[PDB]
Structures are given as C-alpha cells and as structure tokens.
Amino acid sequence: LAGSLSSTDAEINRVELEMGALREEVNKSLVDLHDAQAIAEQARQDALAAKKDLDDSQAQIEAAQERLDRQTYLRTSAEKQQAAVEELDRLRTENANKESVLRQARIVAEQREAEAVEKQVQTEAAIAANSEQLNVLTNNRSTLVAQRDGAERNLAIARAQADXXXXXXXXXXXXXXXXXXXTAASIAAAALIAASQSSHATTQNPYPTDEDADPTDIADIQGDRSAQIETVIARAMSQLGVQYAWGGGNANGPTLGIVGFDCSGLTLYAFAGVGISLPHYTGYQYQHGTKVSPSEMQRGDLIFYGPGASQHVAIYLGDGQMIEAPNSGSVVKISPVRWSGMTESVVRLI
C-alpha cells in the first residue's frame, strides 16, 4: 500500500504537470497573438502616415498647378512661368516618392494585419483543444486524489491492525486586492509596467481595424539586490490565499479567467515591483535574467518545470521553501520546493 500511495502521488504530479504544460502552451500563443496584434497596429499607423504625406504632396501639386493657371514684359512673364514649372516638377517627383511609400506601407500593413488575424483564430482553436485535454487531465487527477485519500485511510487501518450585480462583486474584489497590496513605490513601478503591455487574458484585438485614429501601442515581450528581492517576495507573499485563475493576472493583481492568478502571472506581478517587465509565459520568462544551477538556488530565484520550462514556474523563497500557484482548486500558497520534474536551470532575475 505504501508503494501504491506514493505511486499515485507520482502519477498525480505527472497529470498535474501535463495540465500545466497545456495551460502554459495556450499562455504562450496568447503572448504571440498580442504581440502580432501590436505588429499589425504598428504597420497601419505607418500606412496612415504614408497616406498623410501623400495628401500633403497632392495638395502641394494642386497649388502649383493653380499657380500655372512689350518684349521685355513677355520676357519676365516667361521667367515667372519657369518658376511655376520647376515648382510643379519638384512636387511631381515628391508625389511619386510618396506614392511608392504608400504602396509599400499598405502592402506591409495588409500582410501583418492578416498575420495577426491568423494567429488570433489559431490560439482560439488551441484554447479549445487545451480546454478539452485539461478537463480530461483534471478529471483523472480528481479520481487519483480520491484513490490517494482512500489508500491513506486504508494504511491507517493497517497500522492500527498491526499493533449586473457582478459590478458590486468586482468592487469588492478591488477593495480586496488593493488593501492586500499594503511598498507604494514597488506597486507604482509594477503598475507602470502593467500599463506598458497588453492584457494577456483575452484574444480580441484591442487595436483599430480600419486605417483610422491612432492609439497608444503596447510593448513587445517575446523573443541593492537584497532590497530588490524582499520587495518582489513580499509582493508574492501578499497574494497568499488568492484563488487561482487560468490566464489570470497583471502587475496590479489578479484578473478574470478565460479573479485570480496562474503561475506565470503571479511571478510577473512580484517582479514588476522592481520595474522588471515579464512575459506571461514560463517558456519566455525562462529566457530572462541569468540562469543558475538548481543546487545554488537562493531566495528570489525562479524555479521552472518541464522540458525548456514548458510546464510550470515558481519563485524560490529561500530556506528550501517556495511560493507557487500549483493547480486548479488550490489557492496561491507556500510549499516546500519540489525536485521532481524540475527544469535543468533556475533563473535569477536579481
């Protein structure tokens, strides 16, 4: 029984890491989508600039055309005509240059707008697939934990034998996280970062579709020290007890699912306190900072799981314990560091 207990906990952690891998897979291609969206919006703001200078060259040529519109007096009027003619020649070749600028800005915006459309539908369907596989994984996990609690009960027997009001809901949650974040410098730094990057929880493109208007456009996130660590870690500890939400989280706190945090969302929140802007994907976070051998990990390091950090992420808290958001049904919690399934390196950002 002891063996089967420990083996169903091994299987529990397998299935939990698989679930993690799928969730983070979707998180990754969500990041890719929002960055392609920013790419598309930058291309058409370029296209709009092109149409702008084409119109100025246009009306310049039309003003010169409208300018086009005894022997001594004829002489000086011929010279006036030459002045007008040379101005039109200038504006002419200017308009040809601007026309080519528009041609190429429009084709580039056409291409990379389409590219963002593609990856958008791509990740919605990837969401569908991963939702199905996740629901399977968590059903299996729940039957496994049933088995595990039962087996523990049997082992105990053996040992004995031997011897829209959702608005009000949201306002409440706001009060919650706002005062749980009670430092002010770190939260305002995280907030700056939050306002620097797109929402990594939705897919719908928050940019214009028609080549009209011009918003702000979000940054691009893909491919002493002691004071810094305590601000970040204090931030993570401050969210202890907050419920888990797939895709949830930003620099200011929990967010609506697809109000909580998922593993890579939580780490982003903590490190944003010291102006460290992190992507909402373990695999991309694994590319930041400096890597350290797991045997030399220390307070502040990031612990990753799965091949190339594809499955899970946690923050090392020091003294052999770490803070993490592990799986559905579990709140943000502190747990001793787990060594099984760990990636080949830890990441030290501070």
Listed residues 109, 128, 162: the one ending a domain: 162
324 is catalytic: yes
Cβ neighbours, 10 Å, residue 163: 4
Q: 276, 348 in Cβ contact below 8 A?
A: no
Scanning the structure block, which residue is given the tokens 């010291």? 274
Cβ neighbours, 10 Å, residue 264: 31
CA dist., res. 272 & res. 228, Å (int): 11
119-150 in b/e form (b: 16+ CB < 10 A) is bbeebeebbeebeebbeebbebbeebeebbee
Question: Is residue 314 assigned to a domain?
Answer: yes
326 and 195 inside one domain? yes
Structural domain harbouring 328: 180-348
The coordinates were experimentally obtained by X-ray
Q: What is the CATH number of the domain that holds 108?
A: 1.10.287.620
* 324's tokens: 């993490």
Q: What is the CATH number of the domain that holds 262?
A: 3.90.1720.10
* Candidates 25, 263, 280, 296; catalytic one: 263
280 is catalytic: no
Question: Is residue 89 assigned to a domain?
Answer: yes
Question: Is residue 111 assigned to a domain?
Answer: yes
CA dist., res. 250 & res. 194, Å (int): 6
Listed residues 110, 131, 162: the one ending a domain: 162
Provide the domain count of the chain: 2
Task: Write out the E strands in 70-130.
Answer: none
Which residues, other chains included, contact 106 with Cβ-Cβ below 8 Å and sequence gap of 6+? Answer: 47, 50
CA dist., res. 153 & res. 150, Å (int): 5
200 is catalytic: no
